[PDB]
Design a protein around this nucleic acid. Structure first.
Ligand code: MG
Ligand code: MG
Ligand code: MG
Ligand code: MG
Ligand code: MG
Ligand code: MG
Ligand code: MG
Ligand code: MG
Ligand code: MG
Ligand code: MG
Ligand code: MG
Ligand code: MG
Ligand code: MG
Ligand code: MG
Ligand code: MG
Ligand code: MG
Ligand code: MG
Ligand code: MG
Ligand code: MG
Ligand code: MG
Ligand code: MG
Ligand code: MG
Ligand code: MG
Ligand code: MG
Ligand code: MG
Ligand code: MG
Ligand code: MG
Ligand code: MG
Ligand code: MG
Ligand code: MG
Ligand code: MG
Ligand code: MG
Ligand code: MG
Ligand code: MG
Ligand code: MG
Ligand code: MG
Ligand code: MG
Ligand code: MG
Ligand code: MG
Ligand code: MG
Ligand code: MG
Ligand code: MG
Ligand code: MG
Ligand code: MG
Ligand code: MG
Ligand code: MG
Ligand code: MG
Ligand code: MG
Ligand code: MG
Ligand code: MG
Ligand code: MG
Ligand code: MG
Ligand code: MG
Ligand code: MG
Ligand code: MG
Ligand code: MG
Ligand code: MG
Ligand code: MG
Ligand code: MG
Ligand code: MG
Ligand code: MG
Ligand code: MG
Ligand code: MG
Ligand code: MG
Ligand code: MG
Ligand code: MG
Ligand code: MG
Ligand code: MG
Ligand code: MG
Ligand code: MG
Ligand code: MG
Ligand code: MG
Ligand code: MG
Ligand code: MG
Ligand code: MG
Ligand code: MG
Ligand code: MG
Ligand code: MG
Ligand code: MG
Ligand code: MG
Ligand code: MG
Ligand code: MG
Ligand code: MG
Ligand code: MG
Ligand code: MG
Ligand code: MG
Ligand code: MG
Ligand code: MG
Ligand code: MG
Ligand code: MG
Ligand code: MG
Ligand code: MG
Ligand code: MG
Ligand code: MG
Ligand code: MG
Ligand code: MG
Ligand code: MG
Ligand code: MG
Ligand code: MG
Ligand code: MG
Ligand code: MG
Ligand code: MG
Ligand code: MG
Ligand code: MG
Ligand code: MG
Ligand code: MG
Ligand code: MG
Ligand code: MG
Ligand code: MG
Ligand code: MG
Ligand code: MG
Ligand code: MG
Ligand code: MG
Ligand code: MG
Ligand code: MG
Ligand code: MG
Ligand code: MG
Ligand code: MG
Ligand code: MG
Ligand code: MG
Ligand code: MG
Ligand code: MG
Ligand code: MG
Ligand code: MG
Ligand code: MG
Ligand code: MG
Ligand code: MG
Ligand code: MG
Ligand code: MG
Ligand code: MG
Ligand code: MG
Ligand code: MG
Ligand code: MG
Ligand code: MG
Ligand code: MG
Ligand code: MG
Ligand code: MG
Ligand code: MG
Ligand code: MG
Ligand code: MG
Ligand code: MG
Ligand code: MG
Ligand code: MG
Ligand code: MG
Ligand code: MG
Ligand code: MG
Ligand code: MG
Ligand code: MG
Ligand code: MG
Ligand code: MG
Ligand code: MG
Ligand code: MG
Ligand code: MG
Ligand code: MG
Ligand code: MG
Ligand code: MG
Ligand code: MG
Ligand code: MG
Ligand code: MG
Ligand code: MG
Ligand code: MG
Ligand code: MG
Ligand code: MG
Ligand code: MG
Ligand code: MG
Ligand code: MG
Ligand code: MG
Ligand code: MG
Ligand code: MG
Ligand code: MG
Ligand code: MG
Ligand code: MG
Ligand code: MG
Ligand code: MG
Ligand code: MG
Ligand code: MG
Ligand code: MG
Ligand code: MG
Ligand code: MG
Ligand code: MG
Ligand code: MG
Ligand code: MG
Ligand code: MG
Ligand code: MG
Ligand code: MG
Ligand code: MG
Ligand code: MG
Ligand code: MG
Ligand code: MG
Ligand code: MG
Ligand code: MG
Ligand code: MG
Ligand code: MG
Ligand code: MG
Ligand code: MG
Ligand code: MG
Ligand code: MG
Ligand code: MG
Ligand code: MG
Ligand code: MG
Ligand code: MG
Ligand code: MG
Ligand code: MG
Ligand code: MG
Ligand code: MG
Ligand code: MG
Ligand code: MG
Ligand code: MG
Ligand code: MG
Ligand code: MG
Ligand code: MG
Ligand code: MG
Ligand code: MG
Ligand code: MG
Ligand code: MG
Ligand code: MG
Ligand code: MG
Ligand code: MG
Ligand code: MG
Ligand code: MG
Ligand code: MG
Ligand code: MG
Ligand code: MG
Ligand code: MG
Ligand code: MG
Ligand code: MG
Ligand code: MG
Ligand code: MG
Ligand code: MG
Ligand code: MG
Ligand code: MG
Ligand code: MG
Ligand code: MG
Ligand code: MG
Ligand code: MG
Ligand code: MG
Ligand code: MG
Ligand code: MG
Ligand code: MG
Ligand code: MG
Lengths: 64, 149, 202, 59
RNA sequence: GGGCCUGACUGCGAGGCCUGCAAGCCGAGCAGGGGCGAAAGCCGGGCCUAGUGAACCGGUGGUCCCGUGUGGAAGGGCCAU
RNA sequence: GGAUGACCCCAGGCGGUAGGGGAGCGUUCCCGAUGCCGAUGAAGGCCGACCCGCGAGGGCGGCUGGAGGUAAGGGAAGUGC
RNA sequence: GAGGGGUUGUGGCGUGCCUAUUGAAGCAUGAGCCGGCGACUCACGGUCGUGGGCGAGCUUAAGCCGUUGAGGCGGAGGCGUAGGGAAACCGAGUCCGAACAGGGCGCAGCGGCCGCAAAGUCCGCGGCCGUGGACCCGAAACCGGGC
RNA sequence: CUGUUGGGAAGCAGCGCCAGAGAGGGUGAAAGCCCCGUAGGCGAAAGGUGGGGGGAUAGGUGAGGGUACCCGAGUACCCCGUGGUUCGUGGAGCCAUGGGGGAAUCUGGGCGGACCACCGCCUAAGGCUAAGUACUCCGGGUGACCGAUAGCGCACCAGUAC
RNA sequence: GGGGGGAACCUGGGGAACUGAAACAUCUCAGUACCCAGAGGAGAGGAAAGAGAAAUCGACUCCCUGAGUAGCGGCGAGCGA
């Protein structure tokens, strides 16, 4: 049978044009009142996952 | 040329790695598997693309983001695939999404949009949309843009 | 442009023909592999421990008999049990790229051209469906019988005649395939067949 | 494609209308170069002042 | 100790420390509108190093992005919590 | 060096479990084969102090056996205890 | 029949095999001996590498025709040709933002138009991954319908 | 066909012949021409089949005008409990229905993913319907299928002996 | 006229658990195994109170594709039009 796309990944992650894996920053879902705006602000951005982890999530997305 | 003269190139048909066939091969006994544990078992090892020994996985600790959709599923709306002025120099006279579909440039059931990367040709170009840059190069290289619905 | 010799009722003339200049011996191998592979029947079969006719009883208890531990006698470690990775019915066919086989068909014919072993004919004289009748024609045509021949013609009478000599493979032109072109030492064709051949390699 | 136009011969002594065609193309100086479109209008002015002009085709 | 104040900013962030990951940390300078200062400047909480919890699921205030024939709505998304 | 393994010289490396790579031998089958070996003796068996190969192995010869076997070069695996 | 084969008196040296282990001749595991059976495979999908075809294109699936160990047709569809954005949307850009700021993620062959090469894609081959019992043998057990 | 070697020729040698047949198996060893076959042809009084050719029957058939008679009931519909669908209570429609309530006959009713309007699609609560699809006890054809520990459990008096 | 039989195949009526989720309960295995009733050479389905956005299509079955898409999911394992 053909492989199935991992729907947990596809809802958290996007493969870029060269093939980096990019997600949202962790750490601002709650408990934000005493966080400096620089934390709130920098975590509202996207980052590139480290290459080892980046290439496991990519295998979970064989049809993109 | 005879039949017996037919052979492949070198490397065209490599032989396989037969394990478990004895000492002098390199893969005797444990068949390159090491000693004990999972993985060395028939069927062993959880999907190592995903599994991390029980702790919460690198994937699952990342947050979700975006519209996922909901039943009854995705919403049918017009969709556009763009084609550049460079991807038009091969033609003469007119260009329409039908002719662009035969070429292997536009995908069926997609509306046409012209994008501005490349040289503009004096072509009469029927399309569903044009980028501002694609319009300027076109309406200023001798060609006729035909916007349609 | 190779110069193919044409046999005629009105004289050995010649006829310029455009076949591939250089042959790719690996490509002709790739076509022949695929021909000989998609014809494989794929009917080797064995039975798995689950497909074998014994029952699933545990033959003796797990512990305390002093013998080995076993389960059912269908296990492949038993004589008469299942076989582990025995063959099952397989489809060995695969879609060799069209352009590849189209190329191999032109390159295989080209090799015989680049050898003086390709000979085109307009018709076959006193041959109307009898093996003697073809035999005579083959004598007048140089084709004594000291060399294997592919006979490519849409004339069934001609085909019926030669198809039984050990040194002759007969074919309708729609059947032209590189394996048979390689199998044989020479190659004879109709201008009706040459005309078709030109159609297919374009 | 485009048009790389070199003006190599002075308009001096040529008709007033040939002199204005130069000015339409934006060519005002000897050994000056303007890359233009290939509009039949733009081309005709290049074809009118053909004898004073050397033309490369780009794109 | 005092006087005026709210930078316990908003939009970004070169470059680093630390580091298996994910985190954690430090950060010049730019723009918006400011506080204090004659000014040089300083200010994106606290002498520093503990006072904390990924994601999932939901709540609330915005935004007006999607809205299953069409306009709306239901429900989501995004920003903040 | 000569000229792309055309072979010769010179120099240096070559303990090894897990494991990574490389080059080969052998087994059954297919094309090669309407061929070719074969009763003046096939396959298999028993010997061998003989030949080739680093080796796995391949020859050769004598006995047994009495009807099969199968090349160069490729192809596929129920392929080596 | 200047050698070799058999045998072995004496001298010298010498702790079986496999498995498991930091470490076994080990007084740790397995094996009486012999012959035969006995364990890393296949499908589809993936990801690399590699051998070829074509190359901004590559390729068909089911079928239909043909063959009767003959190939062909079929372009539906799939991958590629553009990305950025949750999306609307814009597009060689785009997103955050008040910004023409900063930033994230993106955007450009070799020799004389010929010749070679290449994105890519197709098929073969090989390593490895996913799904399947997935290297083979082995439970104690759970469940169903019967005896 | 003959000669030769041999227990035996189909081997080897000589001179031929057939081929729409040179697939394959036999025959004392290796046979196109010895045998059984093969290529190509022919065949059914009787039973079964007959989806194809023909015939027969059943059957099928208008146009405006008025009338508002009919158009499938414990049904639609709604609320409760569930199942089905990719849909796990979700914004949860659709299809089905165990319980309660309970219509209308085209100006009727159902659907287009809560609901409302608009615009459309369709005519529920009666039934039947080839073909293309599945399977292999059975028969035949073919294997880069097994070759007696293999291949079915059984090549043999095997679902037997025990 | 029924009754009973038939290797698989079919429909309907009932309907598990191991296992997977590296524990487990929703979920998974799976409407699978099995039981029962019935049908045949096939069975089911079938002539729109359909689809669903095409101002469109036109019974049903079956294959390829669409597509591991849309979505479903202790948004876990997975499930999947
Ligand atoms: Mg599956
Ligand atoms: Mg995303
Ligand atoms: Mg959280
Ligand atoms: Mg938030
Ligand atoms: Mg808080
Ligand atoms: Mg703080
Ligand atoms: Mg702050
Ligand atoms: Mg704050
Ligand atoms: Mg911070
Ligand atoms: Mg912000
Ligand atoms: Mg991947
Ligand atoms: Mg993948
Ligand atoms: Mg896809
Ligand atoms: Mg191989
Ligand atoms: Mg292998
Ligand atoms: Mg190897
Ligand atoms: Mg050994
Ligand atoms: Mg070995
Ligand atoms: Mg190795
Ligand atoms: Mg080793
Ligand atoms: Mg090993
Ligand atoms: Mg061992
Ligand atoms: Mg092991
Ligand atoms: Mg290994
Ligand atoms: Mg390996
Ligand atoms: Mg291992
Ligand atoms: Mg391994
Ligand atoms: Mg081990
Ligand atoms: Mg160990
Ligand atoms: Mg270990
Ligand atoms: Mg071990
Ligand atoms: Mg260990
Ligand atoms: Mg271990
Ligand atoms: Mg262990
Ligand atoms: Mg290990
Ligand atoms: Mg492994
Ligand atoms: Mg590992
Ligand atoms: Mg598993
Ligand atoms: Mg396991
Ligand atoms: Mg834990
Ligand atoms: Mg989506
Ligand atoms: Mg079998
Ligand atoms: Mg078996
Ligand atoms: Mg078994
Ligand atoms: Mg089984
Ligand atoms: Mg069983
Ligand atoms: Mg059984
Ligand atoms: Mg039994
Ligand atoms: Mg059993
Ligand atoms: Mg049991
Ligand atoms: Mg049992
Ligand atoms: Mg015991
Ligand atoms: Mg004992
Ligand atoms: Mg025992
Ligand atoms: Mg025993
Ligand atoms: Mg036991
Ligand atoms: Mg057993
Ligand atoms: Mg027994
Ligand atoms: Mg057996
Ligand atoms: Mg087994
Ligand atoms: Mg197995
Ligand atoms: Mg394969
Ligand atoms: Mg023949
Ligand atoms: Mg022949
Ligand atoms: Mg031949
Ligand atoms: Mg032949
Ligand atoms: Mg034939
Ligand atoms: Mg023929
Ligand atoms: Mg033929
Ligand atoms: Mg030849
Ligand atoms: Mg002048
Ligand atoms: Mg003047
Ligand atoms: Mg002058
Ligand atoms: Mg004038
Ligand atoms: Mg104070
Ligand atoms: Mg003030
Ligand atoms: Mg940085
Ligand atoms: Mg880091
Ligand atoms: Mg900290
Ligand atoms: Mg300022
Ligand atoms: Mg200031
Ligand atoms: Mg002041
Ligand atoms: Mg100042
Ligand atoms: Mg600052
Ligand atoms: Mg959870
Ligand atoms: Mg939330
Ligand atoms: Mg939420
Ligand atoms: Mg609100
Ligand atoms: Mg809107
Ligand atoms: Mg709106
Ligand atoms: Mg709407
Ligand atoms: Mg309104
Ligand atoms: Mg909202
Ligand atoms: Mg909400
Ligand atoms: Mg050296
Ligand atoms: Mg040396
Ligand atoms: Mg050394
Ligand atoms: Mg070594
Ligand atoms: Mg060594
Ligand atoms: Mg065989
Ligand atoms: Mg043969
Ligand atoms: Mg002989
Ligand atoms: Mg003899
Ligand atoms: Mg043999
Ligand atoms: Mg021998
Ligand atoms: Mg050696
Ligand atoms: Mg030997
Ligand atoms: Mg002898
Ligand atoms: Mg012998
Ligand atoms: Mg024989
Ligand atoms: Mg042999
Ligand atoms: Mg062989
Ligand atoms: Mg060989
Ligand atoms: Mg294989
Ligand atoms: Mg085996
Ligand atoms: Mg091998
Ligand atoms: Mg061995
Ligand atoms: Mg001696
Ligand atoms: Mg001695
Ligand atoms: Mg003595
Ligand atoms: Mg001694
Ligand atoms: Mg001793
Ligand atoms: Mg001693
Ligand atoms: Mg040993
Ligand atoms: Mg042991
Ligand atoms: Mg141990
Ligand atoms: Mg121990
Ligand atoms: Mg002891
Ligand atoms: Mg002892
Ligand atoms: Mg002990
Ligand atoms: Mg011991
Ligand atoms: Mg132990
Ligand atoms: Mg013992
Ligand atoms: Mg014993
Ligand atoms: Mg014993
Ligand atoms: Mg013994
Ligand atoms: Mg043994
Ligand atoms: Mg393997
Ligand atoms: Mg297998
Ligand atoms: Mg594969
Ligand atoms: Mg693959
Ligand atoms: Mg692969
Ligand atoms: Mg090609
Ligand atoms: Mg094509
Ligand atoms: Mg995107
Ligand atoms: Mg904005
Ligand atoms: Mg910017
Ligand atoms: Mg930018
Ligand atoms: Mg090329
Ligand atoms: Mg390629
Ligand atoms: Mg891998
Ligand atoms: Mg299993
Ligand atoms: Mg399985
Ligand atoms: Mg197992
Ligand atoms: Mg495996
Ligand atoms: Mg249980
Ligand atoms: Mg129990
Ligand atoms: Mg229990
Ligand atoms: Mg019971
Ligand atoms: Mg005699
Ligand atoms: Mg005779
Ligand atoms: Mg003779
Ligand atoms: Mg024949
Ligand atoms: Mg036959
Ligand atoms: Mg024969
Ligand atoms: Mg014969
Ligand atoms: Mg015979
Ligand atoms: Mg005899
Ligand atoms: Mg013979
Ligand atoms: Mg023979
Ligand atoms: Mg014969
Ligand atoms: Mg016949
Ligand atoms: Mg007959
Ligand atoms: Mg007949
Ligand atoms: Mg009729
Ligand atoms: Mg009527
Ligand atoms: Mg009624
Ligand atoms: Mg009711
Ligand atoms: Mg309703
Ligand atoms: Mg209630
Ligand atoms: Mg309800
Ligand atoms: Mg469902
Ligand atoms: Mg459905
Ligand atoms: Mg439900
Ligand atoms: Mg469900
Ligand atoms: Mg629902
Ligand atoms: Mg429901
Ligand atoms: Mg309803
Ligand atoms: Mg009425
Ligand atoms: Mg109405
Ligand atoms: Mg009404
Ligand atoms: Mg309804
Ligand atoms: Mg409704
Ligand atoms: Mg509807
Ligand atoms: Mg609606
Ligand atoms: Mg209406
Ligand atoms: Mg409808
Ligand atoms: Mg009605
Ligand atoms: Mg009805
Ligand atoms: Mg029916
Ligand atoms: Mg039917
Ligand atoms: Mg049969
Ligand atoms: Mg049979
Ligand atoms: Mg055999
Ligand atoms: Mg026996
Ligand atoms: Mg047996
Ligand atoms: Mg025997
Ligand atoms: Mg056997
Ligand atoms: Mg039997
Ligand atoms: Mg039987
Ligand atoms: Mg038996
Ligand atoms: Mg008996
Ligand atoms: Mg009964
Ligand atoms: Mg019955
Ligand atoms: Mg059933
Ligand atoms: Mg049922
Ligand atoms: Mg029960
Ligand atoms: Mg369970
Ligand atoms: Mg359980
Ligand atoms: Mg579990
Ligand atoms: Mg577990
Ligand atoms: Mg447990
Ligand atoms: Mg459970
Ligand atoms: Mg459940
Ligand atoms: Mg299962
Ligand atoms: Mg289920
Ligand atoms: Mg059911
Ligand atoms: Mg049928
Ligand atoms: Mg039927
Ligand atoms: Mg009706
Ligand atoms: Mg009706
Ligand atoms: Mg419908
Ligand atoms: Mg319509
Ligand atoms: Mg209708
Ligand atoms: Mg489908
Ligand atoms: Mg698609
Ligand atoms: Mg689900
Ligand atoms: Mg999720
Ligand atoms: Mg699931
Ligand atoms: Mg399910």
């Amino acid at each position: 049978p053909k492989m199935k796309t991992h729907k947990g990944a596809k809802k958290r992650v996007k493969i870029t044009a060269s093939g980096k894996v990019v997600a949202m920053k962790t750490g601002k879902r709650h408990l934000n009142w005493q966080k400096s705006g620089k934390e709130i602000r920098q975590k509202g951005r996207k980052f590139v996952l480290a290459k080892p982890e980046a290439e496991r999530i990519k295998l979970l997305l064989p049809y993109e | 040329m005879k039949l017996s003269d037919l052979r492949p190139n070198p490397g065209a048909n490599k032989r396989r790695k037969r394990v478990g066939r004895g000492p002098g091969s390199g893969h005797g006994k444990t068949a390159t598997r090491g000693h004990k544990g999972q993985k060395s078992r028939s069927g062993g090892l959880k999907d190592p693309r995903r599994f991390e020994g029980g702790r919460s996985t690198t994937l699952m600790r990342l947050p979700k983001r975006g519209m996922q959709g909901q039943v009854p599923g995705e919403i049918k709306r017009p969709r556009y695939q763009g084609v550049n002025l460079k991807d038009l120099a091969r033609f003469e006279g007119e260009v329409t999404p039908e002719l662009l579909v035969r070429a292997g440039l536009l995908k069926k059931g997609y509306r046409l949009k012209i994008l501005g990367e490349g040289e503009a040709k004096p072509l009469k170009v029927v399309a569903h949309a044009f980028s501002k840059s694609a319009l300027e190069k076109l309406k200023a290289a001798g060609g006729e843009p035909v916007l349609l619905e | 442009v190779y110069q193919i010799p044409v046999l005629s009722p009105s004289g050995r003339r010649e006829l310029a023909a455009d076949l591939p200049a250089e042959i790719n011996p690996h490509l002709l191998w790739e076509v022949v592999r695929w021909q000989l592979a998609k014809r494989r029947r794929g009917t080797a079969s064995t039975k798995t421990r689950g497909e074998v006719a014994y029952s699933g009883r545990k033959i003796w208890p797990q512990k305390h008999t002093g013998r080995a531990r076993h389960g059912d006698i269908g296990a492949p470690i038993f004589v008469g049990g299942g076989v582990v990775f025995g063959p099952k019915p397989r489809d060995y066919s695969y879609t060799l790229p069209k352009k590849v086989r189209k190329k191999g068909l032109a390159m295989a014919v080209a090799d015989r051209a680049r050898e003086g072993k390709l000979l085109l004919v307009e018709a076959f004289a006193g041959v109307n469906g009898k093996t003697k009748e073809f035999l005579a024609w083959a004598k007048e045509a140089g084709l004594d019988g000291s060399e294997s021949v592919l006979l490519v013609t849409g004339n069934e009478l001609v085909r019926r005649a030669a198809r039984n000599l050990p040194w002759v493979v007969t074919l309708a032109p729609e059947g032209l395939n590189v394996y048979d072109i390689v199998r044989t030492e020479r190659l004879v064709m109709d201008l009706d067949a040459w005309e078709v051949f030109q159609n297919r390699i374009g | 494609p485009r048009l790389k136009v070199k003006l190599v011969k002075s308009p001096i002594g040529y008709p007033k209308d040939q002199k204005a065609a130069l000015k339409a193309l934006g060519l005002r100086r000897l050994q000056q170069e303007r890359v233009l479109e290939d509009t039949p209008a733009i081309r005709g002015n290049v074809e009118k002042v053909a004898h004073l002009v050397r033309v490369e085709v780009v794109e």
